[PDB]
Write a protein that binds this ligand. Structure first.
Ligand SMILES: [Zn+2]
Ligand SMILES: [Zn+2]
Ligand SMILES: [Zn+2]
Ligand SMILES: [Zn+2]
Ligand SMILES: [Zn+2]
Lengths: 371, 383, 301, 196, 112, 21
């Protein structure tokens, strides 16, 4: 798809946006690609993960949610609308985008359109509130109202599909068609007004069911099972791990670039025994003022070497001025970039690009000449 | 018949009703050690590439974890990064957070732990908000674990604090893609057992349902994060047994600072790469000039102890004749622990190693199996 | 300022010290190094009143503690007051030195009893592990205490570098890095370069010391090994000849350049193993990646 | 009032409709929303189509919220006539039969949700008239209903649900259930020999 | 598995069985031997349908009278669930016995 | 100032886009 290597190499607009974002990559790209003449594909061959991260920083989007449920007032009342909320309103509800297309560029501007929508009956209907005739609504948005009702039947036209027999409730009701028993009373039937027609709460029940169905079905895009469902997982056998087991041999080769008999061993040990039993005079450890001087001299030379090495170890301060230090830093940066490209093309080892490696080699020679 | 408080005094002082007393404490530790009896050297993937996913939603503002879930998960993530790069040095790590339904990358996949420490410290200042998205985080984790080589096992760790997730697409397709790219996912949930996380862990770990972990308290979270630094055992079906070409750099000692090849800054020391003679700042890392791994021998030796773990020490029976009255490693006075004269000799604290038949106390039983990784009796034996 | 523990992992082996006596002009060098060790331990005990001392002798059949004594011998003391060191010195020095020399006496008698068996297995690594366990016990028993290790090994130009000591000693290093316990190495012998102990003392912030003459050893020990852990960061270390931190190959044994390891058991191979199989973990390898590595890099005509 | 506005943040609200096709589509959408971890609530009636036959095993049924005891409409003449006939013939009290019918409907709503002994889920009953009818529940639900759990408020009910869902998520010890809750073949033969 | 209740071999289609299922099976076999009506409560969670079908099929096949079986449910959905459990039971019986015996299992509903 | 740098950058991309097309 769009995340493949060649797509990231060929996406010039994404690379342009990444350069507009980054700051040190300005200096690197300016002093390598602009001046020394690297191919852009060569420069972006080693920075595929950075391009992919910048792509995934903006290409991903939030999941659908009830955006009109979040919009609540706070005499003056204020509501805040983010552009992400506007996009969620457009995605979750096609009727609002339909009104936006033929109302905003034509007659009245965007905030007037949103105020008219929030003061309309359509906002009360899509939120799930009971529609009342005493409310004025808005005379511009309400012409879309029946059209939105059209959308609802088209919603049924994309939602009414046959289901499995595990949860088939239409087969539950129609298990026998000749049920003519006691009619369910008014507690088990939808509520009606004084004239006998429905009060309209079944309308908002169907509306919230339709909204949930639309949210679930929006996930299904490009972005025998009944036996598996009815089987009890506990009564089956537990999972046995199939992890591999290794055994390590310690028959390694010895590192490559005097025999003593037991009688010399034993007589040396006996000499140690008689030297230990008689008098273990500790004062003999004191040196004779010459080997002590030699040992002290060796230790002072070693610690002088170690102190000279470890006297000094954010970059450290230097005697170089800022301009010449920065020139040396950019020359080192472009030389290292050339070296990295040369080595990755050299050890990649395709003959067809091998001559291109020669070009880098010439640039490497120029790098030497540059120094 | 009447009101509740006029019935009778509650009498709270009288509800409390009141030698071999050590045995009840010993049997709990015995039951704890019973779960660790079976052990064998599983093959484990040493070279790891871990993507740590951290939840940063409104559900992370819950007060049930002192002080708040966001800050303490970040602090234990800092500790996790330190332990993970202490015990798995040649691994790589990236950090992704879930915020406002967006997956946010805060650190690129790199072997330097200090960058991840800085990223987590930068996260700790901001506040969590939004509604988390597993699918976006898993998709960026898949993108981050695309360019790592086949010899390196690709792993994703998710600290998912919420109970519901909002996705821009079908998450089962993402699970299928994660399984097809051999990415293993372990999820440490905070509240309860979410279905999609359990299915993701079961699918991406070849049918093992034990990779979805739910904590109990503060200490169990430390236990889980300490368990997570060990490399996961690989399956038998995986055949990516691949040679890795790497070099061992030489630590140079110069009194004149030089330009490093990785950051282009003044560094006094450095490690000369054996392949291209360029110098690097930190270790272990890939060389910026030749794309070759540079590690030390201690970096192999640190993870070498996972290859042959030591068999667990078995507590000796009290009826057996004791080999030694003192420990082999520290000569700790083994307590006779005589509770009473009729109670006799019980629960002797001598622990025997199988390969060398030497006795150790509980202190050395703790130390030889966690910090050290060689039994002193096994190397004292003239084999 | 802060009291410390000093543990001396002394490696006493009659074959190694006999070879050192044969190589050196003098005889009985173990007496001289034991004398230097005793005076050094008395110096460390004089450094602070709350300082503590331990010694492990590693012999050809295993390890044995020398101070403090085997606790049954402490409970029995029976009377074994051998007059090896005079009784008129400072008492805290006297108890430690007498316990050490009595354990030397018992250990040499025990090994003279077992002189008929020649062991090819060196027990320095197990002794270092035992010393680190002792460091753990002393650290967590008393609440803190700094600690240090000392290793008096001998190679004598006879015992070369050994592969089997690679895995244990390395692990010891990390445990030392866990407890901030430096591992200090004195090597007496003709082998100027000992790789594993140098890597140990470099990675544990210790000091390496290779000497050729056993005489005058107390000057060395009181000059360079006397870095107490309370002043480790403020003293620059006299370790010369910095170690390269490399390793050895499995099939050839040479020191390794740019090389290959398996992803299964991490063993280092300087060359591609024959049969496309790892020599240690016995894993089969696919032909594609080893054909990629065996393939020559490109160059134009 | 805006109660459902806070519910819409966490779980999708799905409603049983008298039309059977729309109710079945809502049920399938509820199962799909439970499967992908979005979370959903299924508002249905205890005497309707959903409460009979449809299972809520595993993740489809983590909570069963029984809003009130499901009594019928008493003032309907059909129910009163049937109650009078059963009082005349089968000597069953009217209130006893009404409590029995309401408790059997609530009982089947509670029993639709378990399948498998690894399955878990709380069965909260939100009415003041449930606590007097604990003996009319099925005996397995009754023995699972402790004596301290009859008169809860809302807040400590939430705390108990939190603790229960935290403990049930842990991997159980196979030694703790090897022969007491599930049987292998050899455990079955051992129990047969012990009974003989 | 394959176990025995008195003289009746029961082919249970899972490697493990709950104790409540075994007590249920014993009571059902006792009721079918002694005759007459019975009312049994199986707690949910347990495999009531699968155990019931397993012993009922085994009792039909092993005994020479070969009594037919009527399984009345309250809904079409549980009819489908019972037929799916019957498919699993019959597949296990065919796998264990090595052959597909003379069996007819059909569900009934309206024309719709 | 980075304005001259980004202007020269955009000029380079314009020249490149002229080059491959
Ligand atoms: Zn290099
Ligand atoms: Zn650097
Ligand atoms: Zn011990
Ligand atoms: Zn051992
Ligand atoms: Zn191997």
């Amino acid at each position: 798809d769009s995340l493949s290597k060649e797509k990231l190499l060929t996406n010039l607009k994404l690379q342009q946006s990444l350069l507009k974002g980054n700051k040190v990559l300005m200096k690197v790209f300016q002093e390598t690609v602009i001046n020394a003449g690297l191919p852009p594909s060569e420069f972006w061959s080693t920075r595929i993960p950075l391009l992919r991260a910048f792509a995934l920083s903006t290409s991903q989007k939030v999941g659908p949610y009830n955006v009109l449920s979040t919009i609540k007032p706070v005499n003056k009342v204020n509501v805040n609308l983010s552009r992400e909320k506007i996009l969620n309103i457009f995605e979750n509800y096609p009727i609002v985008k339909k009104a936006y297309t033929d109302n905003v560029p034509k007659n009245f501007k965007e905030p007037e359109f949103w105020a008219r929508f929030f003061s309309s009956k359509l906002f009360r209907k899509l939120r799930g509130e009971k529609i009342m005739q005493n409310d004025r609504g808005d005379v511009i948005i309400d012409r879309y109202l029946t059209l939105d009702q059209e959308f609802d039947r088209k919603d049924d036209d994309m939602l009414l599909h046959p289901v499995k027999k595990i949860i088939d409730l239409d087969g539950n009701i129609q298990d026998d068609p000749v049920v003519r028993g006691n009619r369910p009373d008014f507690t088990m039937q939808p509520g009606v007004d004084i004239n006998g027609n429905s009060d309209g709460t079944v309308d908002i029940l169907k509306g919230m069911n339709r909204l949930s169905e639309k949210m679930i079905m929006a996930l299904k895009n490009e972005y025998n099972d009944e036996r598996n469902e009815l089987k009890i997982d506990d009564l089956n056998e537990s999972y046995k791990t199939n992890y591999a087991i290794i055994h390590l041999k310690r028959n390694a080769h010895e590192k490559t670039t005097l025999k003593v008999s037991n009688q010399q061993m034993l007589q040396q040990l006996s000499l140690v025994m008689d030297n230990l039993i008689n008098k273990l005079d500790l004062n003999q450890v004191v040196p004779n003022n010459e080997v002590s001087n030699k040992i002290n001299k060796r230790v002072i030379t070693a610690i002088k070497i170690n102190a000279k090495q470890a006297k000094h170890n954010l970059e450290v301060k230097s005697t170089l001025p800022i301009d010449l230090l920065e020139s040396c830093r950019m020359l080192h940066t472009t030389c290292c970039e050339f070296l990295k490209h040369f080595y990755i093309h050299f050890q990649s080892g395709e003959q067809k690009q091998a001559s291109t490696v020669k070009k880098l080699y010439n640039h490497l020679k120029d790098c030497i000449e540059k120094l | 018949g009447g009101y509740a408080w006029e019935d009778e005094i509650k009498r709270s002082w009288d509800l409390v009703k009141v030698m071999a007393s050590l045995v009840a404490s010993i049997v709990e530790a015995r039951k704890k050690r019973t779960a660790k009896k079976n052990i064998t050297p599983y093959q484990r993937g040493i070279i790891r590439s871990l993507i740590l996913t951290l939840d940063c939603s409104e559900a992370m503002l819950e007060k049930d974890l002192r002080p708040n879930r966001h800050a303490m998960i970040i602090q234990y993530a800092i500790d996790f990064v330190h332990e993970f790069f202490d015990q798995n040095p040649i691994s790589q790590m990236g950090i992704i957070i879930m915020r406002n339904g967006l997956a946010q990358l805060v650190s690129q996949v790199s072997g330097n732990p200090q960058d991840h420490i800085d990223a987590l410290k930068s996260i700790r200042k901001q506040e969590p908000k939004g509604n988390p998205s597993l699918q976006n985080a898993l998709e960026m984790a898949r993108g981050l674990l695309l360019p790592v080589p086949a010899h390196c096992t690709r792993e994703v760790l998710i600290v998912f604090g919420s109970l519901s997730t909002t996705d821009p697409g079908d998450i089962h397709q993402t699970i299928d893609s994660l399984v097809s790219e051999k990415i293993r996912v372990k999820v440490l949930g905070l509240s309860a057992q979410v279905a999609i996380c359990k299915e993701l862990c079961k699918a991406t770990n070849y049918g093992d349902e034990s990779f979805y972990k739910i904590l109990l308290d503060e200490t169990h979270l430390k236990e889980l994060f300490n368990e997570a630094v060990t490399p996961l055992p690989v399956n038998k079906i995986n055949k990516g047994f691949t040679l890795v070409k790497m070099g061992f750099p030489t630590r140079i000692f110069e009194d004149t600072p030089t330009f490093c090849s990785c950051h282009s800054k003044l560094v006094y020391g450095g490690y000369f790469c054996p392949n291209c003679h360029s110098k690097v700042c930190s270790l272990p890392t890939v060389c910026p000039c030749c794309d070759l791994m540079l590690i030390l021998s201690t970096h192999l030796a640190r993870s070498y102890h996972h290859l042959m773990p030591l068999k667990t020490f078995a507590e000796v029976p009290t009826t057996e004749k004791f080999r030694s009255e003192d420990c082999f490693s520290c000569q700790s006075r083994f307590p006779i622990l005589k509770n009473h004269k009729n109670g006799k000799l019980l629960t002797s604290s001598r622990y025997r190693c199988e390969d060398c038949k030497q006795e150790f106390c509980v202190d050395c039983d703790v130390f030889i199996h966690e910090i050290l990784h060689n039994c002193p009796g096994c190397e004292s034996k003239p084999v | 300022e802060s009291p410390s523990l000093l543990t001396v992992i002394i490696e006493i082996a009659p074959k190694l010290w006999t070879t050192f006596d044969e190589e050196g002009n003098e005889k009985g060098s173990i007496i001289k190094v034991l004398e230097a060790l005793i005076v050094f331990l008395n110096a460390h005990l004089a450094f602070n009143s709350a300082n503590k001392v331990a010694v492990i002798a590693a012999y050809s059949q295993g390890i044995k503690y020398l101070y403090p004594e085997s606790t049954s011998a402490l409970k029995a003391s029976t009377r074994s007051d051998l007059k090896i060191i005079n009784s008129d010195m400072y008492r805290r020095f006297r108890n430690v030195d007498e316990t050490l020399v009595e354990e030397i006496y018992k250990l040499f008698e025990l090994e003279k009893k077992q002189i008929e068996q020649n062991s090819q297995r060196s027990t320095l690594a197990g002794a270092m592990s035992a010393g680190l366990t002792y460091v753990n016990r002393i650290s967590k028993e008393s609440v803190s205490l700094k600690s240090r290790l000392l290793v008096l090994t001998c190679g004598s130009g006879s015992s070369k570098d050994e592969i089997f000591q690679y895995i244990p000693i390395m692990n010891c290093i990390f445990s030392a890095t866990k407890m901030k316990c430096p591992i200090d190495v004195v090597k007496i012998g003709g082998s100027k370069e000992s790789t594993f102990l140098q890597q140990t003392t470099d990675a544990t912030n210790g000091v390496y010391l290779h000497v050729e003459s056993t005489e005058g050893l107390i000057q060395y020990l009181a000059t360079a090994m006397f870095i107490d852990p309370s002043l480790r960061p403020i003293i620059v270390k006299p370790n010369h000849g910095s170690v390269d931190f490399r390793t050895s190959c499995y099939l050839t044994g040479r020191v390794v350049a740019v090389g290959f390891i398996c992803s299964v058991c991490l063993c280092v191979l300087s060359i591609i193993p024959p049969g496309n199989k790892c020599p240690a973990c016995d894993s089969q390898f696919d032909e594609h990646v080893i054909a990629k590595l065996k393939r020559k890099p490109v160059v134009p005509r | 009032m805006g109660i459902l506005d806070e519910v819409w943040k966490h779980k999708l609200i799905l409603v049983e409709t008298p039309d059977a096709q729309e109710t079945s589509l809502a049920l399938e959408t509820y199962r799909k929303a439970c499967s992908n971890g979005r979370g959903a609530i299924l508002l249905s009636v205890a005497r309707g189509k959903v409460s009979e036959g449809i299972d809520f095993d595993h993740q489809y049924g983590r909570t069963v919220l029984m809003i009130g005891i499901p009594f019928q409409y008493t003032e309907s003449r059909i129910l009163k006539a049937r109650l009078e006939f059963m009082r005349e013939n089968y000597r069953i009290r009217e209130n006893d039969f009404l409590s029995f019918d309401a408790m059997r409907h609530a009982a089947q709503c509670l029993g639709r949700v378990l399948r498998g002994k690894d399955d878990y889920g709380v069965m909260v009953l939100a009415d003041r008239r449930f606590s007097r009818k604990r003996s009319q529940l099925p005996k397995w639900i009754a023995q699972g209903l402790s004596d301290a759990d009859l008169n809860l408020s809302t807040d400590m009910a939430i705390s108990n649900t939190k603790q229960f869902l935290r403990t049930m998520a842990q991997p159980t010890d196979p030694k703790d259930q090897e022969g007491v809750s599930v049987w292998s073949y050899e455990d079955l033969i051992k129990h047969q020999n012990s009974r003989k | 598995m394959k176990f025995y209740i008195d003289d009746l071999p029961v082919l249970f289609p899972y490697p493990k069985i709950y104790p409540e299922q075994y007590n249920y099976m014993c009571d059902i076999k006792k009721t079918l031997d002694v005759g007459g009506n019975s009312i049994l409560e199986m707690p949910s969670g347990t495999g009531k349908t699968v155990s019931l079908l397993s012993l009922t099929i085994a009792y039909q096949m092993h005994y020479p009278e070969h009594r037919k079986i009527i399984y009345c449910s309250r809904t079409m959905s549980e009819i489908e669930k019972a037929l799916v459990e019957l498919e699993n039971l019959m597949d296990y019986r065919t796998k264990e016995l090595g052959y597909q015996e003379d069996f007819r299992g059909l569900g009934l509903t309206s024309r719709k | 100032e980075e304005r001259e740098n980004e202007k020269t950058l955009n000029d380079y991309y314009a020249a490149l886009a002229k080059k491959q097309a």
